[PDB]
Ligand binder design. Sequence first.
Ligand SMILES: C#C[C@]1(O)CC[C@H]2[C@@H]3CCC4=CC(=O)CC[C@@H]4[C@H]3CC[C@@]21C
Length: 248
Amino acid sequence: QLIPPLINLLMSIEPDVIYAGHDNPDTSSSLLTSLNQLGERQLLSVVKWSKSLPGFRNLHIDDQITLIQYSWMSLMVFGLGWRSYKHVSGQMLYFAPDLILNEQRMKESSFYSLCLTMWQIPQEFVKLQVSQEEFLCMKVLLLLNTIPLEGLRSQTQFEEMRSSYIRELIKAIGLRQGVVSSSQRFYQLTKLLDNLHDLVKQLHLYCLNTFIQSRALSVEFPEMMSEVIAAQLPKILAGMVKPLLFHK
Ligand SMILES: C#C[C@]1(O)CC[C@H]2[C@@H]3CCC4=CC(=O)CC[C@@H]4[C@H]3CC[C@@]21C
């Protein structure tokens, strides 16, 4: 009625809750393994989600693959941010119902520092009071927020898709937001998206370091996650992609 049909569809295709399969006393290595196992399960969920996301299946299959490989980390941390905001008021990192971390569980300095970086998202969600409708449109824009330096095969269709979801984000903002306030809120949400490129860079570096050192660290990386990391992370970290920005 009052909620636009595409937003209602986005709510209906959200994945169901995903467990890490964590058994909970962790070591640094067991915790990292558990996080990678959860990552493997979420990656599957992302791909299934993509198959139902209006517009995405109409891009060339190579372009679909490329976009999933470029955005998976961003989608994972954005979803972590939503779940932390919804379930624990942004005050713990709710990776899964069986893997919720508070400060006590963040021993190693490097991992704590990474968690402080991830924590900026749920903090911003709390501050701006992001709604489920906003979040769902923002999440699609994230899937569509980086492309190859030479563009996609389906560039035209891609651009149309991105425009449609930007229009839908404006509808989402209009559900609660005035013409000026609604403009200012658009700015605020699209700047959050721009700022995620820098944030995810830290997560990409940490993951690739952990992956290269995995045998030494006694950390296991499952096959699907290992493939996305080997297929694109070094290239992404090297800057050999084109991040899309809403502001400059
Ligand atoms: C620890 C670690 C890392 O190597 C760096 C960021 C991490 C991720 C952060 C975002 C994330 C959120 C999830 O809810 C599933 C699990 C992943 C993470 C899996 C492990 C990663 C890739």
